[PDB]
């Protein structure tokens, strides 16, 4: 009997050096749009979604619901991808920048370097270019998403010197043997649209929460049976030291601007490490999805 | 490999590949052959002792 795999063909001609480059990635993480059983080679990675006017956060949105998989065997005309299941252990290659340890929570993350890159030696075709999302530990993914959101929140006033100091000292991350730096979301003083939507919704839920809760605890101060509401509005009286249709639209806007932030305020851990092989390029991670 | 007790560092299953090569080293000893002896060898003269 065989195993429930995904066959993958290659429409372009393959050479022996390209297959020899491909067989380095035996147990590598690969994303897939929908789990069919015969896919073309234009659906192996994120190069179908690499775009100019859209950037990182759109790729994070597409990756969080992408159905990832693992390669199993490379041969002529067919690439056997294995769909991992919840609750089995799988060898996974470390194509990322950082070594892992025993017990790190591991999650997918798109590559920070685009198509224009000097350091990549990957599977390259006439137009098609295989890319591969790294798997970093979840503290690094939280730190990268958080620092990128903060230095994208200053995408409007880069004229000043102190904000240039803030971004250029926020352009880098500090991890285990990692002087790794992340590139700027601002490119030539115009911002990619979805990053703008993310920080706009952040400031919008902040301003809505800081404006309407005082009126609502004014309306709530008559049902006081628990010891929480009085200090809840003591906070609001400490900070300073209406038509119904507008507040209805304000509250619906509050919940929808929150609901558009689920990709940023949470994300699920994908793999987790059972052990690390010597020389730290492989690990046998139990899937958790 | 040699087996040791439990917990001690054991040995991974190990193979190896070694390829030798071959060196070039041609030799030569040239020599000359005299013109009088060659004209007496390759050409035939008259009947003299």
């Amino acid at each position: 009997a065989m195993e429930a795999n995904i066959f993958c063909t290659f429409d372009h001609k393959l050479s022996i050096a390209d297959v020899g480059k491909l067989t380095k990635l035996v147990a590598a993480v690969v994303p897939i749009p929908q789990r069919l059983h015969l896919i073309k080679h234009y659906q192996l990675g994120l190069h179908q979604f690499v775009d100019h006017t859209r950037g990182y956060v759109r790729l994070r949105g597409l990756l969080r619901n992408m159905t990832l998989t693992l390669m199993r065997r490379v041969e002529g005309n067919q690439i056997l991808l294995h769909v991992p299941t919840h609750g089995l252990l799988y060898t996974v290659l470390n194509t990322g920048p950082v070594t892992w340890e025993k017990g790190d929570a591991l999650c997918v993350l798109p590559p920070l370097f685009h198509g224009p890159l000097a350091r990549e030696n990957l599977l390259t075709l006439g137009q098609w270019e295989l890319v591969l999302p790294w798997i970093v530990p979840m503290p690094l993914a939280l730190e990268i998403n958080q620092r990128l959101l903060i230095m994208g929140l200053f995408s409007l006033d880069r004229s000043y010197e102190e904000v240039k100091a803030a971004v250029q000292q926020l352009q880098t991350i500090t991890f285990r043997d990692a002087t790794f730096t992340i590139p700027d979301p601002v490119i030539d003083q115009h911002l990619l649209i979805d990053m703008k939507t993310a920080c706009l919704s952040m400031s919008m839920v902040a301003n809505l929460a800081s404006e309407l809760t005082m009126t609502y605890v004014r309306k709530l101060a008559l049902e006081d049976s628990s010891m929480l509401l009085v200090k809840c509005q003591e906070l609001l009286m400490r900070l300073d030291r209406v038509s119904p249709d507008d507040e209805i639209a304000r509250l619906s806007a509050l919940f929808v601007m929150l609901r558009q932030l689920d990709d940023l305020i949470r994300e699920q851990v994908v793999f987790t490490v059972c052990d690390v092989s010597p020389d730290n390029k492989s690990a046998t991670c139990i899937f958790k999805g | 490999r040699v087996a040791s007790g439990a917990g001690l560092p054991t040995s991974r299953q190990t193979t190896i590949m070694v390829t030798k090569y071959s060196e070039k080293s041609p030799i030569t000893i040239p020599f000359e052959l005299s013109a009088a002896c060659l004209t007496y060898l390759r050409e035939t003269f008259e009947g003299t002792i």
């Binding site: 340890e101 017990g103 929570a105 929480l228 139990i286 | -």
Partner: protein
């Protein structure tokens, strides 16, 4: 493609001969290695072998206890495999009788180094701990070699003995009078945010409630002093940054009928614990509640 090969019945994974057996049998050789019955074959549990120094393996030679790693700002000994009982010495939940009992038995370097590495802020003290699972076997050397389990049950080899989970008496916490048919176990961390001090409490919750919002409802019902201390700390010291006042995560599930009180014997110190005999470890991500 035929009807005998497409609609074939699914096999029993121990019924056919082993791959090593048929591989030796196709050439018909003899080797002193016995081959006919492989051990650890039909183990649904997932084994994991982890190194540990000798300074943390006391009260661990008994089979069955938790295993929690911490992060440290240093580079080379960066991760340290604390057991469950050693997390209680910093915990202000257990009584001073039991804390001055087991404080006098962890006299080592790395144990007190771990206690000194729970010294920093609480919001990062959430981030330092991540659950590694349970442990069944030891080896009792200078560097003893554990066999960690992460998913599935917890048993001795050849399935002849089911191993249990050991949790100490003051961490044990039931939020009901009548148990259900099943109950999942949990790891509840709370922070009594008082004025000067910030030293937390560790709990294990054997609740029968499945859905997580219906568990944080009972958690907010039974930890009102902790959230009140959290908001007292938020008012009394502004311009600071407190967060994650109560932390919860899954640890598995028992069968809700094998829970009774037993005792530990190690260095002639009796530690009263409750057990969970037919236990399976099934972990989850670290959630929280405010």
């Amino acid at each position: 493609m035929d009807a005998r090969a497409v609609a074939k019945r699914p096999r029993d994974p121990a019924d056919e001969d082993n791959e090593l057996v048929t591989a030796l049998k196709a050439k018909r050789e003899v080797n002193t290695i016995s081959v006919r019955y492989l051990y650890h074959a039909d183990h649904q549990a997932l084994t994991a072998r982890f190194f540990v120094p000798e300074g943390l393996v006391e009260f661990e030679a008994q089979p069955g206890a938790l295993l929690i790693r911490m992060e440290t700002g240093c580079d080379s000994p960066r991760h340290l495999y604390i057991s469950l009982y050693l997390l209680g010495i910093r915990a202000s939940n257990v009584s001073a009788s039991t804390r001055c009992l087991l404080e006098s038995v962890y006299t080592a370097s790395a144990a007190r180094a771990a206690l000194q590495w729970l010294d920093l802020g609480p919001h990062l003290l959430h981030r330092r701990l991540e659950t590694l699972g349970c442990v069944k076997t030891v080896s009792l050397g200078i560097t003893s070699l554990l066999t960690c389990v992460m998913r599935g049950y917890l048993y001795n080899t050849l399935k002849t003995e089911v191993f249990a989970l050991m949790i100490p008496k003051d961490m044990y916490l039931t939020w009901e009078e009548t148990r259900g048919r099943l109950q999942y176990v949990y790891l509840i961390i709370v922070y009594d945010y008082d004025g000067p001090e910030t030293r937390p409490g560790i709990y294990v919750l054997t609740s029968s409630i499945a859905h997580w919002q219906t568990l944080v409802d009972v958690a907010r019902g039974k930890f009102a002093r902790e959230r009140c201390s959290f908001v007292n700390r938020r008012i009394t010291r502004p311009r600071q940054i407190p967060l994650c006042t109560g932390v919860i995560q899954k640890l598995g599930w028992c069968l809700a009928d094998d829970i009774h009180t037993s005792f530990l014997v190690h260095k002639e110190l009796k530690l009263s614990v409750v057990r969970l005999d037919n236990f399976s470890v099934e972990l989850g991500d670290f959630r929280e509640f405010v």
